[PDB]
Amino acid sequence: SFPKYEPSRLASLPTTLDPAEYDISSETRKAQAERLAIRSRLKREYQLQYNDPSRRGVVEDPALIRWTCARSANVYPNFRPNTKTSLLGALFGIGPLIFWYYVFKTDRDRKEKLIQEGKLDRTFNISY
Amino acid sequence: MNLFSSLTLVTLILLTMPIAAINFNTHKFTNYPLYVKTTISCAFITSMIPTMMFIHTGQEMIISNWHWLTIQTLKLSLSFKMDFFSMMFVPVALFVTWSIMEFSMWYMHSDPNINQFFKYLLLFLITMLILVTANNLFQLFIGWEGVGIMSFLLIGWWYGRTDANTAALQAILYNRIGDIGFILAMAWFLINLNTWDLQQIFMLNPNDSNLPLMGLILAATGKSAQFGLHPWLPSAMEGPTPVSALLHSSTMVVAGIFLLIRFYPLTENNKFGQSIMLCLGAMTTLFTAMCALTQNDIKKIIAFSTSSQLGLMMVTIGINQPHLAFLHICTHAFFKAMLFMCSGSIIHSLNDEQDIRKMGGLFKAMPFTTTALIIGSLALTGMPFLTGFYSKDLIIESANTSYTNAWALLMTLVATSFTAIYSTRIIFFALLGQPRFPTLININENNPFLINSIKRLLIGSLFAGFIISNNIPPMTIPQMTMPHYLKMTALTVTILGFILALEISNTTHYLKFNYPSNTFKFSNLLGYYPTIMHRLTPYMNLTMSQKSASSLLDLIWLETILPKTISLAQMKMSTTITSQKGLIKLYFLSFLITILISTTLLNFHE
Amino acid sequence: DAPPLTLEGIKDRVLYVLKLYDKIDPEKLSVNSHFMKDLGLDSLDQVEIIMAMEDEFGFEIPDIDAEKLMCPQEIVDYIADKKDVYE
Amino acid sequence: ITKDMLPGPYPKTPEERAAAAKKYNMRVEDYEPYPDDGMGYGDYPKLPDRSQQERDPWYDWDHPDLRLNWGEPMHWDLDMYIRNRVDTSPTPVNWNLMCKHLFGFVAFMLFMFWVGETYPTYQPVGPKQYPYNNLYLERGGDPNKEPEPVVHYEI
Amino acid sequence: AFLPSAAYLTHQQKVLQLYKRALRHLESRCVHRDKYRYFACLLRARFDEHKNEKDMVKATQLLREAEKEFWHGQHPQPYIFPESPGGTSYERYECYKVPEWCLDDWHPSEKAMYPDYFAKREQWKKLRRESWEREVKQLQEETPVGGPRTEALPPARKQGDLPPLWWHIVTRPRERP
Amino acid sequence: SGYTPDEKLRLQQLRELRRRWLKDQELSPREPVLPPRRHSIFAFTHVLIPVWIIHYYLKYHVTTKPYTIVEKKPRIFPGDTILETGEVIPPMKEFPDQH
Numbered sequence A: 001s002f003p004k005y006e007p008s009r010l011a012s013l014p015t016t017l018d019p020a021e022y023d024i025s026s027e028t029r030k031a032q033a034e035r036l037a038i039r040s041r042l043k044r045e046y047q048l049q050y051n052d053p054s055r056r057g058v059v060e061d062p063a064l065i066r067w068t069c070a071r072s073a074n075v076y077p078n079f080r081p082n083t084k085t086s087l088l089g090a091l092f093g094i095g096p097l098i099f100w101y102y103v104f105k106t107d108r109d110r111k112e113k114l115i116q117e118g119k120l121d122r123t124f125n126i127s128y
Numbered sequence B: 001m002n003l004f005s006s007l008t009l010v011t012l013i014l015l016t017m018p019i020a021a022i023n024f025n026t027h028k029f030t031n032y033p034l035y036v037k038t039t040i041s042c043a044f045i046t047s048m049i050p051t052m053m054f055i056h057t058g059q060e061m062i063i064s065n066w067h068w069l070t071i072q073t074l075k076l077s078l079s080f081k082m083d084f085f086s087m088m089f090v091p092v093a094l095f096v097t098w099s100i101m102e103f104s105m106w107y108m109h110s111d112p113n114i115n116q117f118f119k120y121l122l123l124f125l126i127t128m129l130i131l132v133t134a135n136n137l138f139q140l141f142i143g144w145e146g147v148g149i150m151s152f153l154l155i156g157w158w159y160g161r162t163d164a165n166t167a168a169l170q171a172i173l174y175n176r177i178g179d180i181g182f183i184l185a186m187a188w189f190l191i192n193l194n195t196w197d198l199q200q201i202f203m204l205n206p207n208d209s210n211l212p213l214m215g216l217i218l219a220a221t222g223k224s225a226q227f228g229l230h231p232w233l234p235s236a237m238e239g240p241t242p243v244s245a246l247l248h249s250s251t252m253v254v255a256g257i258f259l260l261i262r263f264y265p266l267t268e269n270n271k272f273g274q275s276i277m278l279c280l281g282a283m284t285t286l287f288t289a290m291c292a293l294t295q296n297d298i299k300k301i302i303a304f305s306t307s308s309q310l311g312l313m314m315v316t317i318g319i320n321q322p323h324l325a326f327l328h329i330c331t332h333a334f335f336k337a338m339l340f341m342c343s344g345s346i347i348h349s350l351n352d353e354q355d356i357r358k359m360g361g362l363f364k365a366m367p368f369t370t371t372a373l374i375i376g377s378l379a380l381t382g383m384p385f386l387t388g389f390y391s392k393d394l395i396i397e398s399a400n401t402s403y404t405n406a407w408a409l410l411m412t413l414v415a416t417s418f419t420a421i422y423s424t425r426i427i428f429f430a431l432l433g434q435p436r437f438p439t440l441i442n443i444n445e446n447n448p449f450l451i452n453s454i455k456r457l458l459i460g461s462l463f464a465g466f467i468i469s470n471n472i473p474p475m476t477i478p479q480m481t482m483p484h485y486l487k488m489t490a491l492t493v494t495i496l497g498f499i500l501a502l503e504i505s506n507t508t509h510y511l512k513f514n515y516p517s518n519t520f521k522f523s524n525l526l527g528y529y530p531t532i533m534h535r536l537t538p539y540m541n542l543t544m545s546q547k548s549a550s551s552l553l554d555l556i557w558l559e560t561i562l563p564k565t566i567s568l569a570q571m572k573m574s575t576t577i578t579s580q581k582g583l584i585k586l587y588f589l590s591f592l593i594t595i596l597i598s599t600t601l602l603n604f605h606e
Numbered sequence C: 001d002a003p004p005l006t007l008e009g010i011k012d013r014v015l016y017v018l019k020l021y022d023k024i025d026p027e028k029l030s031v032n033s034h035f036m037k038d039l040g041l042d043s044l045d046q047v048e049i050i051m052a053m054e055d056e057f058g059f060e061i062p063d064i065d066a067e068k069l070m071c072p073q074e075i076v077d078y079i080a081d082k083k084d085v086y087e
Numbered sequence D: 001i002t003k004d005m006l007p008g009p010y011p012k013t014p015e016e017r018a019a020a021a022k023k024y025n026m027r028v029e030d031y032e033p034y035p036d037d038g039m040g041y042g043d044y045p046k047l048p049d050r051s052q053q054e055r056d057p058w059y060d061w062d063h064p065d066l067r068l069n070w071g072e073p074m075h076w077d078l079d080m081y082i083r084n085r086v087d088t089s090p091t092p093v094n095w096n097l098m099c100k101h102l103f104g105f106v107a108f109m110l111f112m113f114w115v116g117e118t119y120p121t122y123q124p125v126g127p128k129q130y131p132y133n134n135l136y137l138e139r140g141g142d143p144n145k146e147p148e149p150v151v152h153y154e155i
Numbered sequence E: 001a002f003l004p005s006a007a008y009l010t011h012q013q014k015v016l017q018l019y020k021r022a023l024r025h026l027e028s029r030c031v032h033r034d035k036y037r038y039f040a041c042l043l044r045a046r047f048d049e050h051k052n053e054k055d056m057v058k059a060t061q062l063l064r065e066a067e068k069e070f071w072h073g074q075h076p077q078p079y080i081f082p083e084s085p086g087g088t089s090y091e092r093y094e095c096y097k098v099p100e101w102c103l104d105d106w107h108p109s110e111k112a113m114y115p116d117y118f119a120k121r122e123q124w125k126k127l128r129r130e131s132w133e134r135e136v137k138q139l140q141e142e143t144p145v146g147g148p149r150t151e152a153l154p155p156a157r158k159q160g161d162l163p164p165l166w167w168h169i170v171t172r173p174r175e176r177p
Numbered sequence F: 001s002g003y004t005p006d007e008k009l010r011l012q013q014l015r016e017l018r019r020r021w022l023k024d025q026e027l028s029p030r031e032p033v034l035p036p037r038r039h040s041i042f043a044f045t046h047v048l049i050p051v052w053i054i055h056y057y058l059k060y061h062v063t064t065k066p067y068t069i070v071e072k073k074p075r076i077f078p079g080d081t082i083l084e085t086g087e088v089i090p091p092m093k094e095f096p097d098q099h
């Protein structure tokens, strides 16, 4: 009848087609009301400072500061060298270095061997 | 000589004078747009004199007036090439820009930053005439990057809108991908020919011109939005309608086509480059015209129209007809700027409504816009002896009668039928039928700015192909002998496109509901190409820009190997040295072991 | 261009659309005529009325705001709030 | 900002997981960190990897262009899922079907351009005939040499 | 799903939102007004056929396959209003929506160009800064323990008092500055 | 159903304050209180003086230097007369007339 929509990484499943949206249980109402309570407490704590006439400046968000501290400063203190990190750091670290080394060395050996035999047309080449 | 070069440079300096006027301001201007429009009117009038005295004799010259920079054997001078290409494209661009700015004095009238808008639009015009009057690759690169940056600043005009910033950065991205090939071309010409000047490039005339012409084709694919580097030109409809009308119809988007036309002595001796240009132009003019058939935003339809016509220009370059391609540039400018201006008149009259499914009944309510839109569509499809007849039909007469990639020819003719299909789609859903826009009618087009600005491009779209194509000198030999099914190819295929799309239009009034097919969803979702590539290619970059490059390498591993392991080594050796228990017995026992290793193990007494 | 909206004009246009709707008689109708309690209209009819408001004034009302417009005066006041009338 | 509101190490004990969930202002049932393979995340939550375009555009957001509230834990790639960038919104056609259609169309067109290059069209004519030894001097041929005579005849 | 005051979507809300989305995508499919009007009545009949379903599991299942019907039969480029998200004029004027606090940063020689406006502005500023502590003590005497459950704000429960957290709703910029 | 009376009262009060704000955005007729502040001049200042300047620059600083302005030599036809010399270009051969 109908083709089932297959969600991918760059195209997620719609809310209208997800089965877990149609849960009418009590515990999902618990989780949704608790998320509403946490979000309402965050909203209230925001706009009690946002609407303040005495405040003049930047409402500091601990979520944003926490995000930047995770993206920059917490990376090395929670690094553990193991199999996956060693293979990915040697695969994406020195793999391209080896690759471009052999490509550029091969191209320049071919070019120098053509030049010292008089084969490469270097006729009007006086800028280098 | 003294008149030609004088008015040549007076045109350009006259364009640069209102930039000094807007940069040296203190007051609120008494209608700076009227000042810039008068300036461009006078620049058009000034540029018509060297054009007339090029029609008279064929007078070409070079003004290498200012010695700028000598890199040991490369003398870069400020050099202006006044040939056929400059002499025709400069007055057409000035005339079109004059109409676009008299349109802009009305369309952008409520904008509080209208003086910045006319400043940016004049800076675009200055950089484009730097591009087309350039004589070396460096000054052409100046004009090239200049029209790219003014494209950025004019797409992202409403910069608070996220999608305008996104489309502007998209257009910059695709143009820099083309600039890779342009700088490849400049690199090849400097290393192999010791020049960026066009004269030494053309006089040395290399036969190993595969690599620089591939670079120039990549540059034109970036700039003219050919296939692979196409979607930014539909994305570039996010800017205002004069931006989509001047830059993205007629003037900037032909700069890649103009770049390949400028290097016609190199493409005329490279059959492989001609084959690549023919295949790429036919692919582009098929794909964009096919995507145009199912769109509903009117500016997107006209953007796929102008990218299809740029693909047709790349086709007629690829069949070794560069002067017909440049004639099609100068032809296409008039009616495509006019089609964008008529669509913008409809958009402004319907309270910023751009979707054609909220239009209709505009045949009589907007009579002048309807008249000029129908004249523009007939010039686009190639009604006989309108302006689009005097190049495009001849293009088909040279596309059939040449040693041609036959699949490229057949897709060019299918695209020619598709042009008629989307033209009558515009006329049907916009002008015909009954209204679909809301109930508070504020339809009005009684501004003399709007009327005169569409009127001059209307006179252009009626007469300019005839005037130009009878004023140009013959630069090739026109094929005028062909069989009667072949002479009647373009006209019959265009009429069949009209008839098939009349069937398509009349099947929309039927009281039947159909499910969308895969051809329809393939055309409506832009060949799936901005959906996949604008989700996939950022993803595999940006994760790699963070997880691989930022986090793993330059926050962890390159941080691990040199400083952290050495620091931990010094910490551990420091703790091994200084963990002594303060016991004199153990220190003298160490001294004993020192003396024994000194005598028996190292022989420091022998 | 773009003539300004007034509460009298928005009221006249909203009641003009509701008078062109066959499930509402024009003499019972007022600005306080509740759709479910006075006019006896379905919730589907209320959704169609809000869609007619969208097609009339040319902008989209979100559904979380659409499902609370249960009289013409609240519709007129929402269009007043989203078009900023009586400046 | 203080230290125990900053991100820390990977939580293992359930009170540490609940303290992390309280720190990032989310439920313990919804707090899932990145799995401790040693990639440098720590206690940072693995938010569900959706774009910001997918959010409710009519909701009263604290940051309207970001579509993001105050104190809500940001995604690790929040600068990547901004609306200027990667969108993971659902598409009407399936992703794999889109990739197959685009790949098949491009491959078929390039195949048929190669076919037409193998079998080109032409006109039933002879070669274009040029005088003066196929224009020997005009094509830069040197006059101190003498080419072969190219002779054309009437027909 | 995601709502400011409601914690979920009822079955009735899901049905009405599906009904509106189906009519909008149908109007995108069925461009002409008489033809859409015909098929809109047919779709209204399809929605009215299962309106009296007291079995909630059967009704939720019918809602689910109706969503599948919708996801199959949607237009790839549906119509979007211009100032609606995804529209061609959406968030266009946000670059012109300069906030009001920047008027505090003006030079006095350009504040003296509009003396009535800033003299009329200072009483708004005074009104807000006297209303602030009253609406803070109104919020803390009405919010339950554990914080507010919903994002719904109360009105002013006295006379003369302003509603709590009112300044950025009232002094928001116009849509067309 | 629709609103609750709490939401009705709040949105009514916010609507009243919003309309008062939008009213107080208006302009007094004395405002803006400003501080106290040749027919073809465009063809003279933007055209004729630039033609003067650019012709002076091209005539006495550009063409005084070699190869700065290099013009293509004029196209010569059979039957022409050279202005510098007076040499008449001889005409072509008589045509083998075709029609």
Ligand SMILES: CCCCCCCCCCCCCCCCCC(=O)OC[C@H](COP(=O)([O-])OCC[N+](C)(C)C)OC(=O)CCCCCCCCCCCCCCCCC
Binding pocket: B065, B066, B067, B068, B069, B076, B077, B078, B079, B136, B138, B139, F053, F056, F057, F061
């Ligand atoms: C309103 C102001 C205008 C002037 C008002 C007052 C004067 C009135 C009118 C008289 C004209 C002025 C007197 C004559 C002018 C000077 C004549 C002269 O010999 O000048 C010496 C020279 C002429 O060139 P030159 O070759 O003699 O000297 C160059 C110097 N060497 C040789 C050492 C390298 O300089 C100029 O004239 C400078 C004018 C520059 C104008 C264009 C600027 C373009 C800026 C772009 C920068 C980047 C370019 C990069 C790309 C370049 C190409 C690849």
Ligand SMILES: CCCCCCCCCCCCCCCCCC(=O)OC[C@H](COP(=O)(O)OCCN)OC(=O)CCCCCCCCCCCCCCCCC
Binding pocket: B163, B166, B167, B170, B173, B174, B177, B180, B217, B218, B221, B227, B228, B229, B235, B280, B530, B533, B534, B535, B537, B538, B539, B541, B542, D083, D084, D085, D086, D087
């Ligand atoms: C004659 C030969 C012809 C050959 C033709 C084909 C050659 C090129 C092949 C394909 C490469 C280019 C296309 C892929 C990248 C496109 C990126 C782009 O434009 O992304 C746009 C995207 C937003 O797009 P969209 O979703 O439509 O926006 C409207 C609603 N938001 O915006 C974003 O998501 C923001 C992204 C920002 C970061 C960009 C990361 C990707 C960078 C890619 C670099 C590619 C370098 C190529 C080098 C080629 C060298 C020869």
